[PDB]
Amino acid sequence: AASGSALIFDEEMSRYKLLWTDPECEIEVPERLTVSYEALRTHGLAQRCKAVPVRQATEQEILLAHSEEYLEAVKQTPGMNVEELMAFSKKYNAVYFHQNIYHCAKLAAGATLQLVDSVMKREVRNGMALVRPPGHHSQRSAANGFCVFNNVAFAALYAKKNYNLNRILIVDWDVHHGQGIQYCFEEDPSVLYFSWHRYEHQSFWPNLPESDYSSVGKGKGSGFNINLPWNKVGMTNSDYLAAFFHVLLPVAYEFDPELVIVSAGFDSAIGDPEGEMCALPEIFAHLTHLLMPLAAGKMCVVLEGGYNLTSLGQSVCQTVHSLLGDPTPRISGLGTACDSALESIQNVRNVQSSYWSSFKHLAQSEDIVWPEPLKRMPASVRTVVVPPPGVELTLPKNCQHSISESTAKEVQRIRDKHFHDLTDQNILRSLGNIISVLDRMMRSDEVCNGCVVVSDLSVSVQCALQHALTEPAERVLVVYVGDGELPVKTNDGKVFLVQICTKETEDKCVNRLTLCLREGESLTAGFMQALLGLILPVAYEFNPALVLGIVEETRLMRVWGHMTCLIQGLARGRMLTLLQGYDKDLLELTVSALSGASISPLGPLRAPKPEDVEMMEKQRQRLQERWGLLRCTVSESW
Numbered sequence: 001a002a003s004g005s006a007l008i009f010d011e012e013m014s015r016y017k018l019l020w021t022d023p024e025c026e027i028e029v030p031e032r033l034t035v036s037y038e039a040l041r042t043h044g045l046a047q048r049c050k051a052v053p054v055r056q057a058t059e060q061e062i063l064l065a066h067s068e069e070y071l072e073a074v075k076q077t078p079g080m081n082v083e084e085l086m087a088f089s090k091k092y093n094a095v096y097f098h099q100n101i102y103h104c105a106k107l108a109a110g111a112t113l114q115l116v117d118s119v120m121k122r123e124v125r126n127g128m129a130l131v132r133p134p135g136h137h138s139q140r141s142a143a144n145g146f147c148v149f150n151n152v153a154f155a156a157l158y159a160k161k162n163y164n165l166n167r168i169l170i171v172d173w174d175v176h177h178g179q180g181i182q183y184c185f186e187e188d189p190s191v192l193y194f195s196w197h198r199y200e201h202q203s204f205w206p207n208l209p210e211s212d213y214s215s216v217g218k219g220k221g222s223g224f225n226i227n228l229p230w231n232k233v234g235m236t237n238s239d240y241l242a243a244f245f246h247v248l249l250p251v252a253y254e255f256d257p258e259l260v261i262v263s264a265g266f267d268s269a270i271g272d273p274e275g276e277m278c279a280l281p282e283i284f285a286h287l288t289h290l291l292m293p294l295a296a297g298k299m300c301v302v303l304e305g306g307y308n309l310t311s312l313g314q315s316v317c318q319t320v321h322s323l324l325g326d327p328t329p330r331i332s333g334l335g336t337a338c339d340s341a342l343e344s345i346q347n348v349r350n351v352q353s354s355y356w357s358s359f360k361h362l363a364q365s366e367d368i369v370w371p372e373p374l375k376r377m378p379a380s381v382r383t384v385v386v387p388p389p390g391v392e393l394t395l396p397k398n399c400q401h402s403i404s405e406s407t408a409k410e411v412q413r414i415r416d417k418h419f420h421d422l423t424d425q426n427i428l429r430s431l432g433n434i435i436s437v438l439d440r441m442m443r444s445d446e447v448c449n450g451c452v453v454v455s456d457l458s459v460s461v462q463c464a465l466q467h468a469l470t471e472p473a474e475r476v477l478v479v480y481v482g483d484g485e486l487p488v489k490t491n492d493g494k495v496f497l498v499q500i501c502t503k504e505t506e507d508k509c510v511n512r513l514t515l516c517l518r519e520g521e522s523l524t525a526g527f528m529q530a531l532l533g534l535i536l537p538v539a540y541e542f543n544p545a546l547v548l549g550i551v552e553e554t555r556l557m558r559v560w561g562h563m564t565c566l567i568q569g570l571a572r573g574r575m576l577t578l579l580q581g582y583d584k585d586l587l588e589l590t591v592s593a594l595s596g597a598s599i600s601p602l603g604p605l606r607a608p609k610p611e612d613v614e615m616m617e618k619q620r621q622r623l624q625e626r627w628g629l630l631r632c633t634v635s636e637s638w
């Protein structure tokens, strides 16, 4: 199993710059690279990454995406003086050339291919390339928008040719539309391209009609190009997460890519002079995290744009933190996307509904300042495991088995006050472990999450929940797989209960989400539908301080690892899972996902039952006025 994160960088890519006056071009500067690397070094992140060297892309590699005529033309720019470079630059839009830019372009491209090789060879889990010049605007025969050669396009074409991959996802979260990537894979269903971008009704550069939501691809590629235009500036964390939960992720997990490549422009971050969006650097920690369960974690992040040197360094750090598996920061203040984003989201979902299952829409009808991000630190041990007495297991290197007298006195207090007749000395053991791991998770910063196997469900849950609330945990998200009633009160706003059950039951609290999924071959696709489109939107808005997972002993959850992995985007990754009864496999799967191991892909699934989609949309209707992040349409105004 692959481990580690590659960081691919070279100061040579900082050795070209703009050589004449041009206020529009002067934003793209060498310091973008140096500020990004130095931020990674300052925070100790570069030192934790494998420093794979850059190389030049070969001529044959450049020819995968560009014409001989265009390559030959750019190959002559090293020999040009400044007058000649300016004249060559004016043949293209929004791009400048320099004696060294052809050299650097070949390095930016080779760097990306090195990243692809390291990930696909399993030499690292994932990685990031800090490159100049950017790539995603460059085309078959044109430089465009500071881009010379299309780095991310090369990476997908190279991965197809040399690793015979059938499905590649490209996620372009730069604030500009990567039209060069769109054109490259327009007719290609093997490479799914997603882009959000500032558009403003085509008035924002590059001002293309085909950057709109209606470009879904051509021919066999129809449905494999997804454009999400932002028609207002000021988009927030909530808008970006709505885009992921209600557009990108449902398609990504159904597509089931074999490799994820990210066109990572951070000009979509707050403070950027080109993007003028309002999302915080912390959001990129979660954008990265939400994609990591795809392709067994094989993710290649490639730097595109980003022009506020402060915003840029912080967003690069948040991304690498997540690649290294550090705990995600808590996102507060989430709610509904704005109306213009909901309109863009509504429109993309509708035009894409002929290609993607979950999008169908009827029933039978169809100076800027922001706070510095907090420090993100991996816990001493990530995952504590407490299997039944007398069960020793092989644990991953960042897990550990679990009982002091302070703790022992507390279990005594709890028994005498709340369970008078309880004397099962094994239950009293679990209760001592529950309190002990929670104390390490919450107050100690030494442990991140934990799994405890339990026998008595009610006393275990009550002790876990009540003890967590006084840690203090202002809010606790409970995720319960099983039927029956739990000793959990959801009446004061401190607890949200997600219940995956088998019996259909009436929901009356807006602090509860009950999912009765019809048993069948389709339970997997429906659960993933609910996870990305219902559970995660509410969980992120709730913003809990702790997640409490509970699984009763009463087989069909080939979904648990994805849930465990994605739900660690909440509560800085602080999740306590209580498994009722010993299941060797479920315990090993739970520990593996809790500890940050890569997740096995889901592959293909029978599309969800209409009864399930109906049940889920009734939940969204019932909950979205309280929990606006659930909205994937514009509200109907009175």
Ligand SMILES: O=C(NO)c1ccc(Cn2ccc3ccc(C(=O)NO)cc32)cc1
Pocket: 024, 025, 093, 094, 095, 134, 137, 145, 146, 147, 174, 176, 205, 265, 267, 274, 304, 305, 306
């Ligand atoms: O790559 C980017 N971000 O990551 C990126 C790409 C393009 C631009 C805008 N831009 C930059 C020089 C320039 C010149 C003319 C025009 C023009 O023709 N305007 O109408 C536009 C221009 C900004 C950033």
Ligand SMILES: [K+]
Pocket: 172, 173, 174, 175, 176, 177, 178, 195, 196, 197
């Ligand atoms: K984009």
Ligand SMILES: [K+]
Pocket: 185, 186, 187, 188, 189, 191, 192, 193, 217, 221, 224, 225
């Ligand atoms: K495509």
Ligand SMILES: [Zn+2]
Pocket: 174, 175, 176, 265, 267, 304, 305, 306
């Ligand atoms: Zn950009």
